[PDB]
Amino acid sequence: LDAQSPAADLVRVYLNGIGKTALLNAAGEVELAKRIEAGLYAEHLLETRKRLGENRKRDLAAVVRDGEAARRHLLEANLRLVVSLAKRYTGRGMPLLDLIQEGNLGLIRAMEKFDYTKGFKFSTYATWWIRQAITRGMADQS
Amino acid sequence: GIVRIGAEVRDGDILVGKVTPKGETELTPEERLLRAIFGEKAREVRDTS
């Protein structure tokens, strides 16, 4: 066939891609981040006590895999928030895609260098970091 | 934030309370406006009463 078809909006593709997100209500995020911490500690100990041949030789690798999986979801957790904050700062000439991408970069730079430290909802911290990142993007765009 | 008049005080007791902000990255021209519009009271504070 050779019939033509209409194009698709880029934003709608983003919404379809993130529709699978399901926020954890800020409650379970602490254990979510305890999975990352233990994963990194597994990283270190895997290459520190190397000689040990044991059934545990696979459990820590599973903890590292759990840490890799725990981040893949934590990042999904905040895309609604980042898109909202980005949309809050539109109308300055930039396509919403460029701002939301910049906020995505800011988020990934944040949470991966964040600790609960008996801190408050990480959502406030993410909002702050992504807001700073998008503000910097707009400023450098001029 | 001050002790009521006529209240007995013992050694080691608190006499007046205050909060000391925490240190983070700052910019003189942008942080002022940013703090004015958004991000109010979102930084750590120490105790130096």
From Swiss-Prot, chain A:
Induction: Expressed in exponential phase, peaks at 10 days and decreases after up to 50 days in culture; induced by detergent (11-fold), heat shock (23-fold, 45 degrees Celsius), low aeration (2.5-fold) and oxidative stress (2.7-fold, SigE and SigH responsive). Seen to be induced and slightly repressed by 10 mM H(2)O(2). 2- to 6-fold induced by starvation. Its basal expression is largely under control of SigE, probably via MrpAB, although other factors including SigH also play a role. Half-life of about 2 minutes. It comes from the Bacteria. Residues 9-43 are annotated as: Sigma-70 factor domain-1. A motif (Polymerase core binding) lies at residues 98-101. Residues 1-142 are annotated as: Sufficient to interact with RbpA. Residues 74-142 are annotated as: Sigma-70 factor domain-2. Disruption phenotype: More sensitive to SDS (cell envelope stress) and hypoxic treatment in vitro. No effect in human THP-1 macrophage-like cells, intravenously inoculated BALB/c mice or aerosol-infected Hartley strain guinea pigs. The sigma-70 factor domain-2 mediates sequence-specific interaction with the -10 element in promoter DNA, and plays an important role in melting the double-stranded DNA and the formation of the transcription bubble. The sigma-70 factor domain-2 mediates interaction with the RNA polymerase subunits RpoB and RpoC. Belongs to the sigma-70 factor family. Monomer. Interacts transiently with the RNA polymerase catalytic core formed by RpoA, RpoB, RpoC and RpoZ (2 alpha, 1 beta, 1 beta' and 1 omega subunit) to form the RNA polymerase holoenzyme that can initiate transcription. Interacts with RbpA, probably 1:1. Sigma factors are initiation factors that promote the attachment of RNA polymerase to specific initiation sites and are then released. A non-essential principal sigma factor that responds to cell envelope stress and hypoxia. Controls a regulon of about 40 genes, with another 100 genes expression being altered during SDS stress and about 50 gene being altered during diamide (oxidative) stress. This is RNA polymerase sigma factor SigB.
Swiss-Prot record, chain B:
Transmembrane segments: none annotated. Signal peptide: none annotated. Disulfide bonds: none annotated. DNA-dependent RNA polymerase catalyzes the transcription of DNA into RNA using the four ribonucleoside triphosphates as substrates. The RNAP catalytic core consists of 2 alpha, 1 beta, 1 beta' and 1 omega subunit. When a sigma factor is associated with the core the holoenzyme is formed, which can initiate transcription. Interacts with CarD, TRCF (Mfd) and RbpA. Belongs to the RNA polymerase beta chain family. This is DNA-directed RNA polymerase subunit beta. It comes from Mycobacterium tuberculosis (strain ATCC 25618 / H37Rv). The gene is rpoB. The chain holds residues 788 to 836 of 1178 of the full protein.
